[PDB]
Design a protein around this nucleic acid. Structure first.
Lengths: 145, 50, 121, 119, 203
RNA sequence: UUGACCUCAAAUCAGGUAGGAGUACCCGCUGAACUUAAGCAUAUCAAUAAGCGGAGGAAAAGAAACCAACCGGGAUUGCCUUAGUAACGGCGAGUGAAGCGGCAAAAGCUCAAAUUUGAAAUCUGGUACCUUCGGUGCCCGAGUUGUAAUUUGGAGAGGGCAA
RNA sequence: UUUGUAAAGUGCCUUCGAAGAGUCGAGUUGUUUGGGAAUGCAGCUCUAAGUGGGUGGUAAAUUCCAUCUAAAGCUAAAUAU
């Protein structure tokens, strides 16, 4: 059992662990599946980009707050200070996080500038029609990095 | 038995009409592997258990 | 304000109006036809030499009758098909599961002179 | 050969009834002749014929009932659709397209605008 | 409005009025069956905020459940195992009594769908509940989309999969550091962290 | 005395619905012991197999009475890492998560609680018609022990003002 | 067909701003957890509150802070097969 000169090995295999082995042979296969999803959705969305905008946001706890990160959505203050309302921002393609609050000025100004650079660099089709087909960019996060 | 219900006699009727060899003409038929009847139930060998 | 007298000391369900049925639609679309008619009551005659002996001698037709029929429906099907009166009927169940009807005619009709009219002889 | 279906769909009920009674006499007079000769394939092509008549009569008796419950509610259970048990269950297209009037106001007020990030 | 007054009266249950009404109603409900129909809710404020829109196709049942611990089976108190798993008396039944009441009145009324249920009364022997069942194929429910989601075939027997108001409580489902063993449902987050994840290129 | 109300019934009343099967995956209850500890009574196997109740093409979960303690993040789920870690354990045998981070996918919302009171404005059923998964009229019924409209925590309501 | 003197949104001021109880929480008991002076569930017993409540992973009081709203509900795709 315990033997010659070898570390203590902890291996959590005293269960029926062969009932629950999940090997991922489908990996590259599922990749093709997801890419077809991002083809199929990219035919449906009427040429709008796939993803919505996400805000510049400052990371949590002491290890990670040196970086900056794509958040969830713009606040109800950043959206309102961009000139447009909340539900209209939802319809434009601006993702809105209703519950986060701004207590920083650089992040607020970066998000408002990000909304200005977005709202200036889109064109919105009329409700009625005549539809000038504008050749979608698939990624909105890569366009505004 | 010698004085029966109907259901058991109905199954005896089926057990009679199955107790026969192959028709002689099937052994000439195309793609045939059936060379005899592998379900001949006799009364001295196998009791059918109703 | 005034109380009804009750001579019994037992209370039971009041006699209420059990209403009839009047559906919005029929139970099934088409009422099914006659499942067991005279064409399906008798199926074949029987031409064993014993049955032919009873035909030629005992004035009795020997038919193979369907498993659902009874001595009433056979006493009616022969009169409907062959237009001949029918005495006592005797139906056994053959051991291969098909019913056998010994139908005895009256003395007015000859069993051979109807057996060659139906064909089997 | 036997009878054909399009030739029976022109005849009335009274002609189909006598057509069926003649063929059921034909079965009797062939089942008598089946035993006095070694083989008789012809009986196959008479009993199929009775099947054909028993289709058409039933068909002409069903669609007539389909015209006496036409358009109204509550047609019988063998005339309404089958499809499966689980589709004869939960909401139809109307009862699942129903939405409350507040959310109709919110669908008309702010619909999904078709946009594009180009310039 | 008049529901704040009923709410504040029902929050004071050891006052003289509510203990008289408690005693009269516990007698009246004990004189009837176990599972029986209530013509009208006895707590319209508390029925109403659980979802009782009083119209056609909403049904109140009232139900007693036998009170106390769950005594085990295994005849004559012998368990035939270790002395760990050897107690017979003091076992305590991981679901609530309110879940037992909901499952029983969802088995009697089996065409109906249970929405929620609430406490009405208790004595030493029984607890008494009112369950607030919805009839899903009535046409006043199959439209007007505030309530047609109960028409869906995935909501069959909510009370017996733990999806009512006391089901998700007694399944331990909530957000938190406190609910870690059971937050996505206990047994899926058991099987996904005793799964051996093995890739094509072994990490 | 006749008419309502309430509560409870009866009908082969009008129209509906439930059971049963399959169970690979899912949601719960209930629940062992072999075994490991080189013995065994806690432990371990295992919150497992067996038993039972319930669904679907996925189910469940889900828009924070959350995580955090940062320059704060933002519903849920899943993957890689955290991590064989912090912790539990005759502190033995063993057991053993979570926040952060990268990614896949991202969609948000609804009742109760406020007199609409110059007007239940709501809903079901029957009957008639039709451009009949539905629409209109009329007539009963539900319902004010309260159905609709307005609002739902991020806001919002009643007023006043200018677009 | 133009469904319509209807609906919707935006700005300023004033008075407000209703928010779920035998439930939260607590004692004991069984069970479970990695949860350690009690992580979750559950039985009984006691039973709230309103500038309140819950959580902030060693019990307790005192003074602050932080962060979200319970005890009612719906919901695709990623996921398992």
């Amino acid at each position: 059992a315990i033997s010659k000169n070898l570390p203590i090995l902890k291996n959590h295999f005293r269960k029926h662990w062969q009932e629950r082995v999940k090997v991922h042979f489908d990996q590259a296969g599922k990749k093709v599946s997801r890419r077809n999803a991002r083809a199929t959705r990219a035919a449906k969305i009427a040429p709008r980009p796939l993803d919505l905008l996400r805000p510049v946001v400052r990371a949590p706890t002491v290890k990670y707050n040196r970086k900056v990160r794509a958040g969830r959505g713009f606040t109800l203050a950043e959206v309102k200070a961009a000139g447009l309302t909340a539900a209209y921002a939802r319809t434009i393609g601006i993702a809105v996080d209703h519950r986060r609050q701004n207590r920083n000025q650089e992040i607020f100004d970066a998000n408002v500038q990000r909304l200005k650079e977005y709202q200036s660099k889109i064109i919105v089709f009329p409700r009625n029609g005549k539809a000038p087909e504008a050749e979608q960019v698939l990624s909105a996060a890569a366009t505004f990095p | 038995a010698a004085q029966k219900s109907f259901r058991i006699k109905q199954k005896m009727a089926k057990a009679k009409k199955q107790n026969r060899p192959l028709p002689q003409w099937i052994r000439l038929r195309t793609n045939n592997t059936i060379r005899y009847n592998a379900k001949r139930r006799n009364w001295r060998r196998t009791k059918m258990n109703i | 304000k005034a109380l009804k007298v009750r001579t019994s000391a037992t209370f039971r369900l009041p006699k209420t109006l059990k209403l009839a049925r009047a559906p919005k639609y029929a139970s099934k679309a088409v009422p099914h036809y006659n499942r067991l008619d005279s064409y399906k009551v008798i199926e074949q005659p029987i031409t064993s030499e014993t049955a032919m002996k009873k035909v030629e001698d005992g004035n009795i037709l020997v038919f193979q009758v369907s498993m659902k029929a009874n001595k009433y429906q056979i006493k009616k099907a022969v009169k409907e098909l062959y237009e001949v009166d029918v005495l006592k009927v005797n139906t056994l169940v053959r051991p291969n599961g098909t019913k056998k009807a010994y139908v005895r005619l009256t003395a007015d009709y000859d069993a051979l002179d109807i057996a060659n009219r139906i064909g089997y002889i | 050969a036997g009878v054909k279906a399009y030739e029976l769909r022109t005849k009335s009920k009274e002609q189909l009834a006598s057509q069926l009674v003649d063929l059921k006499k034909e079965l009797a007079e062939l089942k008598v002749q089946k035993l006095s000769r070694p083989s008789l394939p012809k009986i196959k092509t008479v009993r199929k014929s009775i099947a054909c008549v028993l289709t058409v009569i039933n068909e002409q008796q069903r669609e007539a009932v389909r015209q006496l419950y036409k358009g109204k509610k509550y047609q019988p259970k063998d005339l309404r659709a089958k499809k499966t048990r689980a589709l004869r269950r939960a909401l139809t297209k109307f009862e699942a397209s129903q939405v409350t009037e507040k959310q109709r106001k919110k669908q008309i007020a702010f619909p999904q605008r078709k946009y594009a990030i180009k310039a | 409005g008049a529901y704040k007054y009923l709410e504040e009266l029902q929050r004071k249950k050891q006052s003289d009025v509510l203990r008289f009404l408690q005693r009269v109603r516990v007698w009246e409900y004990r004189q009837k069956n176990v599972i029986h129909r209530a013509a009208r809710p006895t707590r319209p404020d508390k029925a109403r905020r659980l979802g009782y829109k009083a119209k056609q196709g909403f049904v109140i049942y009232r139900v007693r459940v036998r009170r106390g611990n769950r005594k085990r089976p295994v005849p004559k108190g012998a368990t035939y195992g270790k002395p760990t798993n050897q107690g017979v008396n003091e076992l305590k039944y991981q679901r609530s009594l309110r879940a037992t009441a909901e499952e029983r009145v969802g088995r009697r009324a089996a065409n109906l769908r249970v929405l929620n249920s609430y406490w009405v009364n208790q004595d030493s022997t029984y607890k008494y509940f009112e369950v607030i069942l919805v009839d899903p194929q009535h046409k006043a429910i199959r439209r007007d989309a505030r309530y047609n989601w109960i028409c869906d075939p995935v909501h069959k027997h909510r009370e017996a999969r733990g999806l009512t108001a006391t089901g998700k409580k007694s399944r331990g489902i909530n957000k938190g550091h406190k609910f870690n063993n059971t937050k996505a449902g206990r047994r899926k987050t058991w099987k996904r962290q005793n799964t051996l994840s093995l890739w094509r290129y072994r990490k």
